[PDB]
């Protein structure tokens, strides 16, 4: 969901950049690639 994730979350960094490593941070490094 790079529209929702990329557009809607971290394009203006609202919310912060570490929560993407936290709220989406459970063994999903394939989806981070």
């Amino acid at each position: 969901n790079s529209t929702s994730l990329r557009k809607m979350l971290a394009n203006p960094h609202f919310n912060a950049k570490d929560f993407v490593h936290d709220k989406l941070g459970n063994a999903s490094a394939i989806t981070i690639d």
Partner: protein, 100 residues
Amino acid sequence: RNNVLTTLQRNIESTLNSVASVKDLANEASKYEIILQKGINQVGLKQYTQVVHKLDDMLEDIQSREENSEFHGILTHLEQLIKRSEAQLRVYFISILNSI
């Protein structure tokens, strides 16, 4: 549209590395001990200074991470290459600013 760059592409281009991994920054930071140890005039203005934004911005979310050994070693390699770069900068400042 300059605001579309300056708001969306600004913090988008900032939060590119919102999560980014641990070893790769050591790899390309070491490749910035390749390129940052090529001098200034070989490398060039926003080439050199923007690579300083790449280690500046590679020391970036690591305060946001956690304490392993690669954390401290990459803090050493990063910040000492940073101050090598900064010394080289002010050297070049003074180098032309009494070229008169």
